[PDB]
Design a protein around this nucleic acid. Structure first.
Ligand SMILES: [Mg+2]
Ligand SMILES: [Mg+2]
Lengths: 108, 49, 49, 143, 40, 54, 58, 49, 133, 49, 142, 239, 157
RNA sequence: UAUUAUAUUUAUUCAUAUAAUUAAUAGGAUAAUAUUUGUAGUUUUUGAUACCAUGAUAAGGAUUAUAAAUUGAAAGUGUUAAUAUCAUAAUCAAAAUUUAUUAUUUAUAUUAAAUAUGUAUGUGUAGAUAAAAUAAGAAAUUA
């Protein structure tokens, strides 16, 4: 069948047991997001920092289709900022002498 | 597959050169012209077709 | 594990190593891949007869 | 009463039994209730708190090869300062447990809009206008 | 010419400056220790 | 005809077909007989003695 | 022509859901015939704006 | 087109439509290369020309 | 008990072939064995069907000028047709005839392939405009 | 008869209506257009003779 | 739509009072087509140039049996008056006839001679509610 | 007007209605050809044996090998009953079909002792022979299963050679009209919609279609039907 | 017909097909129509060769020919109905109820985007977009830039 | 009680729909030869319709706040997938106001291309209503 393609190759994980630690469970009046992680948002911005995703040159991220979130165009691999620039590049920069605009008008 | 068949696809280029060079294509052995005609019908087609 | 992607690729990429599988299969075994007629609750809808 | 009728889905090569009883209900007074949660291998071990009973050679191999968990937890929390990870409140929570072992008119409707760690990220069926957590609408110029 | 160029398969034309696949990308994701000095 | 052996009805048509089969099995005669060309029913061939129903 | 051939043929192994165009700019000899397009004096009678109405082209 | 309009009854009219969308042929020459001695010894394009 | 659209119909193909050909079973489309197509319409019915389906221009429409009814009813009001001899008294007749409907071969490419300015599109292939023949 | 002549459709049901499973394969981008290059037995024979 | 005055009552939504781009409203309803102007008489709702030919619709184009009404963009010509032949136009409820011929019509399109929205109202095409609403606006007496 | 034959019914008389286009496994629509005029074992009902068939040897080859024998080509007579065999195919040898499975498992010596002639090596050409070409075929399958490289069956064999009309087995082309209900072994539940549906086993089987198909002569075919024409029980549009 | 054995759930989808044929008729009649218009309305002389009484005569001859062409498709495009190829929902083009590059109505665009069928990208509902050109001058500017790369970058010959 | 302000500004004459037939495939120059030029087997079915005939996305501010950061929400607004058993109602122009749900041009100069609105000057004047703390500029009466 054409549909023979859409079978499950592997046995899917069963639901054996209870809701996870600090699950959203709603009592008499509760405003509940299934979406927001209960434990990792409660954790202070001072400590964890404003980052939603790893701090990496953004070329590695893609704005997802159908999901409000970004993903990495190489699954899960990450290259640090240091790998975008030349070795020991001041403020990782193609060349250390000037900022982008400085480079433009020097060139002109 | 058998890769080296791609070579036959050179042929319609060579034939074109033979016309630029003034080598008449009808002096080619009957034999070779059979093999070439085959090679053609594999890779050559016109804008019409 | 779960499948992130799916591709149709020839079976000779991964096939059980010749020393693991029975000797010449084409010649000594008649194999047909066919579909169960009965309703299969779970498991595969095809089997090798 | 014009009572609505729903016809049962039977197990299918892509739609196994548990998926059906968990994602599909034939009684339509139970529609549009809310999300249910379940646990898998590790999150189940955390929630259920199954004490491991001692066992054969592997279990004593792993009683002797254990090392300091007081420390390992600490390390793993720290490691969130690595370039490729974030710092997690969960990792911290695990450390803590091991140490202590002995606008304002709209923020009903802005509930997704800060920098939000997600669990399940929202999807376009469920969220009309949200852009995602990484997004900056009013960017400043930075060198 | 040839459909697959000599440079690919002929060891006379071997390029000594090419490196294997695994090495560069392992070397790349390296984050060296940020506290190289006292004070900073 | 190349892929399947045969012409296939559209999905919609198939739905109405299957439904007729299901509901012809319990009740009869909530029905009507509507054709494109009526002569085939009004003068049927020389044979054709429809099986009586109850 | 061989390079051109490889190049036109990259369209068969392109990545998934990706397409391409081919721009060519080459050099070619043109030939100006002073025989077919001779350079002569302007006619003894000139041509007016009246030979240029709409449909004058036709 | 290699994608969608590659292979069926619409491949023809889509192809032709691209070809007609692409009819433009740009013809260039530098005025530099027009200033050369003509076969008659007179410069082919001089200042006034 | 029986509701038809058309009362009668006819066979596409003629006696010599059919009388013998019937002893060989032909496979009809499994989900709709009986086929009554526009080749099978009678002459009258074909005429009627062919008039309709062309918006305003087409002869079916009462006001196209090709209408054969002598009377037509707009909201309970009965309107009697103005004959063309009478229409012409104030509305001059400029009629070239059928040659006006066909451009030369020379223009076929300007016109995206057609010689014919009629209201329906005209195909030059055998099959699209095929009736039985 | 021919054992590669094989059902491409499922048994007709409401599962074709109530589900987003696709009714045909998506086109395969890298499969070439099928075209005719090849000769008959008769033709080969004619050439040899 | 609320009331179906035609078939389209079933297919179309009103969408409240909705704005369309300039001079494209889906349905061409020319309420203004008879809108008196002495000084603009020859330029208003008529041909932009007086050297234009009369439209298609003043001519018999093909072999006709006859027509019921002539189109409303047909222009009234001295022969319309003089010949004494039926000149009909499709207006609502049914048809408007030019019965009483005048030269003052000549050279204008029948769009312009036929008042689209009459000051006359049928009380019998109106619901009791609609009649109420027409009394509020001070149209119908009551 | 309408009735159980003409209307849409999932089930007619408590069994799945074969008349519905949607009551069949779609695979039944896939195109097939008529077999019946071909050699018995090529036909589709014997499909389990198809991998085994034998390369043919025609009458021409047979006469040629009568006049011009090859040393290591063996012509082996498979005729089973001695009561029916009155002549000797030249240069042949006798291994009756019934013994083959045993015979081919003897050592060279033992085989020599039981059949009185040398056992063909597995390289040599072995041509098999029978009355109709049926037993020779089955024997062929035996010889092929021990792996003999050249095994040819001569169909039409002893009948064509000697002009005898005999048969190895009595099997007739006509199938007995199907007796019971439709076998539950052919009923095919669907995997997606869990819907029970017919297959072409049983009372519905292609054999029955080919068997009752129109004869290939106009006169004999017109004899089969009443004066007015071939199918008059049906409404015009089903004819 | 007469709602017997209809294949599609919405009957009106057929109208969409009718529409296609309208555009086809226009391709067949546009050049012709416009030439007859231009030659008809021309007040200046046509040319050096055709002037005066000949020109007047030829003008009338042409518009007479153009009026004689029965079924010639003269209807302006903005007066043709836009109707969905999917659900046969209609919308006025140039309005927020019609979506131009997919040529579907708002209703279908919504349905198709939310259950993923179209591949688009969501952008903040309130601005101009990701696009530079739209960001500069809005709809009119982008409209212009499209004109510029279709036409003006060519110096025609 | 600390983690900090509603009493400011600007608005309110709001209308627009029409002239019935949805049911199938069929390839052409530069190809080793098909008139397959011109491929001809009426008639047993019935729902999306003008009509009962389940599903699904709107709008609707009321307390997770400032830092490297969005002032728009799930509780569902015509068109979408299992209940059928009155009927062809669909734009391809030029057309007939009763509909809660709409920011119009207000006094030097005023109808040229698709045909394009003739009406209400009345002391910025009842009742009743609308909108905004966001590259703008407003500051003191919580549960
Ligand atoms: Mg709803
Ligand atoms: Mg219609």
């Amino acid at each position: 069948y054409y549909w023979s393609r859409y079978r499950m190759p592997t046995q899917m994980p069963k639901f054996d047991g209870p809701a996870p630690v600090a699950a959203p469970q709603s009592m008499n009046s509760t405003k509940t997001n299934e979406f927001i992680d209960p434990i990792d948002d409660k954790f202070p911005m001072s400590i964890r920092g404003p980052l939603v995703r790893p701090d990496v040159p953004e070329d590695q991220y893609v704005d997802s289709w159908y999901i409000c979130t970004s993903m990495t165009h190489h699954m899960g691999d990450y290259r640090p900022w240091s790998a975008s620039a030349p070795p020991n590049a001041f403020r990782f920069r193609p060349f250390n002498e000037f900022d982008a605009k400085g480079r433009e008008y020097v060139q002109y | 597959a058998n890769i080296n068949v791609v070579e036959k696809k050179k042929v319609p280029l060579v034939l074109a050169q033979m016309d630029e060079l003034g080598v008449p294509r009808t002096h080619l052995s009957r034999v070779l012209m059979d093999e070439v005609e085959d090679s053609l019908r594999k890779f050559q087609t016109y804008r019409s077709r | 594990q779960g499948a992130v992607a799916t591709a149709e690729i020839p079976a000779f990429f991964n096939e059980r190593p010749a020393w693991e599988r029975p000797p010449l299969e084409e010649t000594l075994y008649v194999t047909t891949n066919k579909e169960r007629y009965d309703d299969v609750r779970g498991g595969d809808i095809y089997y090798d007869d | 009463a014009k009572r609505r009728v729903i016809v049962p889905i039977h197990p299918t090569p892509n739609f196994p039994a548990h998926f059906i009883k968990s994602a599909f209900t034939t009684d339509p007074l139970k529609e549009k209730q809310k999300a249910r949660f379940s646990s898998g291998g590790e999150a189940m071990r955390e929630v259920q708190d199954i004490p491991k009973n001692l066992e054969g050679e592997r279990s004593r191999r792993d009683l002797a090869s254990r090392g300091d968990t007081e420390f390992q937890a600490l390390v793993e929390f720290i490691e969130g300062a690595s370039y490729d990870q974030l710092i997690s409140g969960r990792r911290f929570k695990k450390v803590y447990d091991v140490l202590s072992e002995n606008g304002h008119v709209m923020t009903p409707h802005t509930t997704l809009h800060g920098r939000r760690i997600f669990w399940i990220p929202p999807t376009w069926n469920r969220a009309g206008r949200f852009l995602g957590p990484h997004v900056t609408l009013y960017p400043g110029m930075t060198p | 010419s040839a459909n697959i160029p000599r440079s690919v398969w002929d060891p006379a034309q071997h390029n000594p400056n090419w490196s294997d696949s695994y090495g560069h990308d392992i070397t790349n994701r390296r984050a060296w220790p940020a506290r190289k000095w006292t004070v900073g | 005809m190349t892929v399947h052996g045969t012409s296939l009805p559209s999905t919609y048509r198939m739905h109405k077909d299957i439904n007729k089969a299901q509901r012809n099995d319990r009740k009869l005669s909530g029905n009507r007989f509507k054709v494109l060309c009526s002569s085939g029913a009004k003068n049927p061939p020389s044979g054709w003695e429809p099986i009586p129903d109850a | 022509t061989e390079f051109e051939k490889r190049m036109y043929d990259i369209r068969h192994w392109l990545h998934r859901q990706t397409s391409c165009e081919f721009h060519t700019i080459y050099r070619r000899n043109v030939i100006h015939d002073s025989a077919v397009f001779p350079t002569e004096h302007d006619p003894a009678t000139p041509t007016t704006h009246e030979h240029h109405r709409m449909f004058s082209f036709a | 087109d290699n994608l969608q309009y590659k292979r069926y009854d619409w491949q023809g009219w889509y192809q032709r439509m691209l070809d007609v969308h692409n009819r433009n042929v740009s013809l260039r020459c530098r005025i530099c290369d027009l200033q050369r001695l003509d076969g008659n010894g007179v410069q082919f394009v001089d200042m006034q020309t | 008990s029986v509701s038809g659209v058309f009362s009668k119909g006819r066979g596409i193909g003629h006696e010599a072939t059919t009388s013998i050909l019937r002893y060989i079973p032909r496979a009809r489309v499994p989900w709709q064995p009986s086929r009554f197509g526009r080749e099978n319409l009678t002459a009258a019915d074909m005429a009627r069907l062919w008039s309709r389906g062309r918006y305003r221009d087409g002869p079916g429409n009462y006001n196209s000028g090709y209408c054969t009814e002598r009377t037509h009813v707009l909201e309970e009001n009965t309107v009697s047709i103005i004959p063309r001899r009478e229409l012409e008294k104030y509305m001059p007749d400029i009629t070239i005839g059928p040659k006006a409907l066909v451009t030369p071969v020379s223009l076929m490419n300007a016109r995206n392939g057609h010689r014919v300015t009629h209201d329906l599109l005209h195909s030059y292939d055998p099959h699209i405009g095929r009736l039985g023949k | 008869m021919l054992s590669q002549n094989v059902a491409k459709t499922t048994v007709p049901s409401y599962y074709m209506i109530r589900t987003n499973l696709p009714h045909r394969k998506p086109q395969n981008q890298w499969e070439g257009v099928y075209y005719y290059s090849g000769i008959t037995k008769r033709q080969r024979h004619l050439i040899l003779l | 739509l609320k009331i179906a005055k035609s078939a389209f009552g079933f297919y179309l939504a009103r969408r409240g009072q909705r704005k369309y781009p300039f001079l494209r409203r889906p349905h061409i309803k020319n309420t203004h087509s008879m809108n008196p102007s002495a000084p603009y008489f020859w330029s208003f709702m008529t041909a932009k140039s007086q050297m234009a030919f009369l439209p298609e619709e003043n001519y018999i184009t093909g072999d006709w049996t006859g027509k019921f009404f002539v189109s409303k963009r047909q222009v009234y010509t001295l022969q319309h008056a003089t010949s004494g032949a039926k000149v009909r136009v499709k207006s609502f409820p049914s048809i408007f006839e030019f019965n009483s011929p005048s030269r003052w019509n000549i050279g204008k399109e029948m769009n312009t001679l036929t008042k689209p929205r009459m000051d006359l109202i049928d009380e019998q095409m109106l619901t009791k509610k609609q009649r109420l609403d027409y009394v509020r606006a001070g149209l119908l007496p009551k | 007007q309408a009735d159980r034959r003409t209307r849409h019914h999932m089930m007619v008389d408590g069994q799945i209605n074969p008349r519905e286009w949607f009551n069949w496994h779609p695979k039944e629509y896939q195109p097939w050809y008529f077999d019946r005029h071909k050699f018995l074992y090529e036909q589709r009902q014997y499909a389990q044996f198809h991998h085994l068939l034998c390369h043919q040897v025609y009458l021409k080859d047979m006469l040629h090998l009568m006049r011009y024998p090859e040393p290591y080509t063996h012509i082996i007579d498979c005729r089973t009953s001695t009561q029916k065999m009155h002549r000797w195919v030249p240069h042949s040898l006798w291994l009756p079909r019934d013994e083959v499975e045993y015979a081919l498992q003897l050592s060279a010596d033992e085989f020599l002792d039981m059949y009185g002639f040398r056992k063909p090596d597995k390289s040599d050409d072995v041509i098999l022979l029978s009355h109709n070409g049926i037993y020779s075929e089955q024997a062929g399958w035996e010889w092929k299963k021990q792996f003999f490289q050249h095994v040819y069956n001569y169909r039409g064999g002893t009948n064509e050679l000697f002009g005898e009309s005999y048969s190895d087995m009595n099997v007739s082309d006509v199938l007995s009209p199907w007796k019971g209900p439709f076998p539950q072994s052919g009923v095919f539940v669907d995997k997606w919609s869990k819907r029970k549906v017919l297959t072409r086993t049983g009372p519905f089987d292609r054999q029955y279609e080919m068997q009752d198909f129109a004869l290939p002569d106009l006169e004999l075919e017109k004899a089969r039907h009443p004066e007015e024409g071939p199918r008059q029980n049906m409404p015009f549009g089903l004819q | 017909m007469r709602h017997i054995g209809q294949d599609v759930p919405k009957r009106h989808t057929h109208f969409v097909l009718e529409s296609r044929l309208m555009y086809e008729k226009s391709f067949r009649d546009c050049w012709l129509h416009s030439v007859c218009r231009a030659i008809s309305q021309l007040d200046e002389p046509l040319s050096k060769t055709v002037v005066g009484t000949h020109q007047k005569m030829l003008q009338r001859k042409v518009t007479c020919f153009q009026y004689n062409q029965y079924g010639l498709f003269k209807t302006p495009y903005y007066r043709l109905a836009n109707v969905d190829r999917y659900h046969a929902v209609q919308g006025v083009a140039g309005t927020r109820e019609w979506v131009p590059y997919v040529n579907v109505s708002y209703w279908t665009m919504n349905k198709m985007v939310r259950g993923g069928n179209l591949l688009v990208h969501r952008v903040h509902y309130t601005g101009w977009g990701t696009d530079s050109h739209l960001k500069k001058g809005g709809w009119e500017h982008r409209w212009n830039k499209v004109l510029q790369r279709n036409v003006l970058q060519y110096s025609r010959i």
